Ligand binder design. Structure first.
Ligand SMILES: *[C@@H]1O[C@H](CO)[C@@H](O)[C@H](O)[C@H]1NC(C)=O
Ligand SMILES: *[C@@H]1O[C@H](CO)[C@@H](O)[C@H](O)[C@H]1NC(C)=O
Ligand SMILES: *[C@@H]1O[C@H](CO)[C@@H](O)[C@H](O)[C@H]1NC(C)=O
Ligand SMILES: *[C@@H]1O[C@H](CO)[C@@H](O)[C@H](O)[C@H]1NC(C)=O
Lengths: 49, 50, 100, 99, 79
């Protein structure tokens, strides 16, 4: 449920109910490679905690 | 569970005093037995849930 | 050598709902008037089956949460290209994943 | 009536796909930090096996790994106990609703 | 119940090796960490924090063979 608010004041004929996809869980993604680059793999190591 | 003491269960009243003060004693047991069966069925269902 | 064997564990069941008065007194108003003095008998049946279906939903979300706690993936993965490591075959275990 | 569950079965397919691929590629999370056959060697090492022969019989170990997986795949034939345990669930539900 | 947990707040991308094949057909693997390359020296870092350090015999496990995809280190007979 999300009504058209006063700033987002709509001028048409639409319902405030929206039928969406329920997706409760994810994976975090990294921008790295899956194969070894020059014998060495890429990895992400914390540097503060 | 408390709201089951005001159901009729097929009898003419849920009050035992009105059944015992408006009918003949051989004609009252038939109405009292319906209340007894309904209340015991309610208690058995509660005990199963617990 | 290395021996393999599988087990199965069941974690849910079908979610049965019952409309109580349509099972007891399907369409006839004499039956509905007679059933309306048993009172909260259909409401208890509905509430018990509703709480059972709630428990089924909670266990399904817990199984889905446990498989996903702390898994970080490469955003350049592609199961059509990467289904194999160290000459051990993972084609039969993976579904679809990647970006296409 | 029988209501559908709140998640699809393709969503739980995606969750088992992610948990299987988490132990095959960097950063090897379900493999617990280290690469896959590294982790297999460390596992067989902790039972009483020398790391020499695990470095020496590596492709035989991986061949037996593939063979075990394939025989698992080709064994859903009328006497699998897992299939009996799946069919018991369905037959039990159908019998209760018909009765 | 109150549960306390480790939680990173910043990351850095590094290149790691999981093991070294040393001179005389020996091998070393790290313990709870990775072999990195700092200033053209093989170093060891922990796997939950970035801190390179000397490769001692408290950061490694020794093997009298080596696996076929270890990284080559002839200069390493170090501490
Ligand atoms: C992934 O799902 C998580 C669930 O907590 C949500 O917080 C996050 O916004 C989602 N990310 C994307 C990219 O959809
Ligand atoms: C990060 O991702 C973007 C696109 O998502 C890509 O163009 C870029 O090369 C990536 N960076 C690295 C270091 O791989
Ligand atoms: C970690 O972050 C906090 C706040 O951002 C900062 O005060 C602290 O110095 C950081 N640690 C290091 C080692 O830089
Ligand atoms: C060793 O690494 C090479 C190159 O990355 C690869 O082709 C090969 O499959 C690997 N073998 C093993 C046993 O890890």
């Amino acid at each position: 449920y999300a009504l058209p608010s006063s700033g987002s004041a709509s001028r048409g004929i639409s319902s405030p109910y929206r039928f969406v996809t329920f997706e409760p869980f994810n994976v975090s993604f990294v921008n790295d490679s899956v194969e070894t680059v020059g014998g060495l793999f890429e990895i992400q190591i914390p540097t503060n905690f | 569970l408390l709201q089951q003491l005001f159901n009729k269960f097929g009898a003419i009243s849920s009050s035992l005093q009105e059944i015992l003060s408006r009918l003949d004693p051989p004609e009252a047991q038939v109405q009292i037995d319906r209340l007894i069966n309904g209340r015991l069925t309610a208690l058995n269902a509660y005990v199963s849930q617990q | 050598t290395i021996a393999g064997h599988e087990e199965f564990i069941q974690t849910s069941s079908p979610k049965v709902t019952i409309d109580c008065s349509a099972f007891v007194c399907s369409n006839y108003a004499a039956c509905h008037d007679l059933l309306s003095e048993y009172g909260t008998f259909c409401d208890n049946i509905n509430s018990i089956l509703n709480e059972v279906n709630d428990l089924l939903d909670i266990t399904q979300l817990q199984v889905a949460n446990a498989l996903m706690q702390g898994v970080t993936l490469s955003s350049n993965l592609n199961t059509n290209l990467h289904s194999d490591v160290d000459n051990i075959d993972f084609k039969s275990l993976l579904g679809c994943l990647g970006s296409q | 009536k029988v209501l559908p569950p709140i998640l699809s079965e393709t969503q739980i397919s995606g969750y088992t796909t992610a948990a299987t691929v988490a132990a095959m590629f960097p950063p090897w999370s379900a493999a617990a930090g280290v690469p896959f056959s590294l982790n297999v060697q460390y596992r067989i090492n902790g039972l009483g096996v020398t790391m020499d022969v695990l470095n020496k019989n590596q492709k035989l170990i991986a061949n037996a790994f593939n063979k075990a997986l394939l025989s698992i795949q080709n064994g859903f034939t009328a006497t699998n106990s897992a299939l009996a345990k799946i069919q018991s669930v369905v037959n039990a539900n159908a019998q209760a609703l018909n009765s | 119940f109150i549960h306390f947990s480790y939680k990173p707040t910043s990351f850095k991308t590094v290149l790691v090796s999981p093991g070294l094949c040393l001179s005389g057909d020996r091998g070393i693997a790290p313990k709870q960490g990775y072999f990195i390359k700092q200033n053209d020296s093989w170093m060891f870092t922990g796997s939950s924090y970035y801190y390179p350090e000397p490769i001692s015999d408290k950061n490694v496990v020794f093997m009298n063979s080596c696996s076929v995809n270890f990284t080559k280190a002839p200069f390493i007979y170090l501490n």
